[PDB]
Structures are given as C-alpha cells and as structure tokens.
Amino acid sequence: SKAKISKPAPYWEGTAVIDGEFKELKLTDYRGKYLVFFFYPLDFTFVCPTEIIAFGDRLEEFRSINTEVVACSVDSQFTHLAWINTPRRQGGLGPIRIPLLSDLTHQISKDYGVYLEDSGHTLRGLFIIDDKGILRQITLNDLPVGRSVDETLRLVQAFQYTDKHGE
Template identity: 75%
Template sequence: MNNYSCLALVALLLAATIKADDNESCYSFAGGSVYPAGDPKGDHQLQYTKAVISKPAPPFEGTAVVNKEIVQLSLSQYLGKYVVLLFYPLDFTFVCPTEIIAFSDRIAEFRKINTEVIAASVDSHFTHLAWINTPRKEGGLGSVKIPLLSDLTHKISKDYGVYLEASGHALRGLFIIDQRGVLRQITMNDLPVGRSVDETIRLVQAFQYTDTHGEVCPAGWKPGADTVSVVIIKLNSTSNCISSIQIVPNPEEKTKYFAKNN
C-alpha cells in the first residue's frame, strides 16, 4: 500500500469516527429530541393543514378511551362547548404523560368554563388503555379524566397540520375550538417542551369574554382585568353558515385604556 492509499484510508476512518460521534451526540427519542450544542435543527416536514383560525375546525371521528372504556368519539359531540384538542407524540414516553396528567388533574377547572379537553396521538386505543392501566410511578397515566383519542391512520394529525412524516407521529399541537366548532387558537411546540395548563385556561377565558362582552383582551389578560371596548360586527358566511366577526377600533376607548394602564 503506497502513501496515498494510506492517507486515504486514514481519512475515511477519521470521517467515519466523526460521523459516529455526531450521531451519538444527538439523542432522539419518541416525545422529544435533545439537540447537540444547542443547535435545534431537524428534518421536520409538516403536512398541509386544513386547520385555519376563525374557520370551522376540521371534523374528526375516531376510537378513544374514556374512563377505561373504548368508545367512538367525534368533534360534533362537543357542539355547544369549547374544546381543547391536545396532540402529543406517543404513549409511554417522557414529556407526554406530564402534560396529559396536568390537564386531566385540572379538568374540573375547564368544565367550570364549559370546556372539554381531548388528547390525541397516533397510538392505537389498545396502547392508550395499556398506558392508562400502568401506574404513574412506572411512567403510566393511571386514572385520567380526559379522553385519549386514537389517530392510528394519521388522518386527524394531518388535517390539523401537526403530523411529522419522517417521524411517524405528531408535534405538540394545541387547538382551541369554540362552542360553534370554529377554530380560535393554534399553538405548536417542538418536541422537547410541554404546554401550560394555566395559559390554556387563560386563553379560553379570554375568547369567551370577547364572545360575550364585545371587547378585546390585551396581553396577559385575566378575568377581572381591564379590556378595550370596540365595535364588533357579526358577518354571516354563506359558505358555512357560521357567523364571523369584524372588530372596528374605538379610538376614544383605546385612549382611555392606555391612559389608565401606562
């Protein structure tokens, strides 16, 4: 073997070693990724979404586990209530149980404001049931008070634009749907970070307040805080028979709000 061949062989071995080290420095797991050197890059490719703010939420129907029973569940069952639709990557993972348990443990607060929570993943209903039957101390859910919806065909995840084609599961998408079935809010997290129950409740309360009082809510608004008065005009849509709204600013009321709060 001549000197050039030796150098080429060393270069190939070195490149393979570097590649292996790179792979080992980026640990991926179902439910989250830890990026090397704080470099949050991924090959996430999302589907085209049918979920559009202020339009009817994409309808869905599927098999779910509710109170340890396997049932059929659809979005249409919840007309007249607000719905928080919570997508998560996979059962038996790490961040996911903390989110589901957090929302389940506070379901009474949601129901007090006429809101239901549905958690959905691409797992089967049998996997959901097994996860529920696993104690929390062993990474399971134990008894939960919210439905776990199975999206085994990925149709629901794709319709809502949260499905990761390369990974085969959903991102942490959260959708707030109002009592008419209209989509009001979308939040989508990258995999490593869970969502806030407090912020979700605050958002539902804010949308409900604007629906009822015809006022708009400033940043960080909570019930009892000041709002801004506006003129709200309802617009009837002939395509879906659902009224939308147009907010007309009220300069005088805006000035009053800023003078009081600054």
C-alpha cells in the same frame, strides 16, 4: 393542513378511551361547549407525561367554564388503554379523566397540520375550538417543550369573554 383560524375546525372521529372503555368520539360531540383539543407525541416513552397529568388533574377548572379537554396521539386505542392501566410508577399514565383519542390512521394529525412525516407521530399541537365549532387558536410546539394549563385557561376565558362582550 385544513386547520384555519376563524373557520370550522376540521372534522375528526375515532376511537377514544374514556374512563377505561372504548368510545366512538366525534369533534362534533363537543358542539355547544369550548374544546381544548391537543396532540402529544406518543404513549409509553421514557419522559414523564406531566402535561396530560396536569390537564387531567385540573379538569374541573375547564369544566366550570363549559370546556372539555381531549388529548390525541397516533397510538392505537389499545395502546392508550394499556398506558392508562399501567401505574404511574412503572412508566404509565394511570387513571385519567381526559379522553385519549387514537389517531391510528394519521388522518387527524395531517388535517391539523401536526403530523411529522419523517417520524410517524405528532409534534405538541393544541387547538381551541369554540362552541360553534370554529377554530379560535393554534399552538404548535417543537417536541421538547410542553403546554401550560394556566395559559390555556387564560385563552379560553378570554375567547369566551370576547364572544359575549366584544373587543
């Protein structure tokens, strides 16, 4: 694992799905803004994707504080694309406004210390990266428990407040 608090967050690049198209995406495309970078275990499971949907539905609240949100699994960009194109009712994701980055090679998961070598995918990991590319926060959940948009917004707001005013 290369992810260390107060150090540049580890570099990543891959293929994401953004508004239904394949795009090359780099961690460093987000310099100048806070980034919530998070991992989820797999597309197309039998468990509703409440957390991705929750982050998707609430994106303008991140955007109004100069923050982007990128989600990532070990799935191919082709799987992400199909998942998005499957309607929510059939067990799919549906349209989403959050980029789904593919970590097909697993390099990215390993660098972020979230990769489950016995399973082949990640745990639930979330990372808050500031506008200088510095890693400010790490949250790792065992699989059965998701993340909260509200907790994430508090953390982002607090790191931004302390960046300007100290303490």
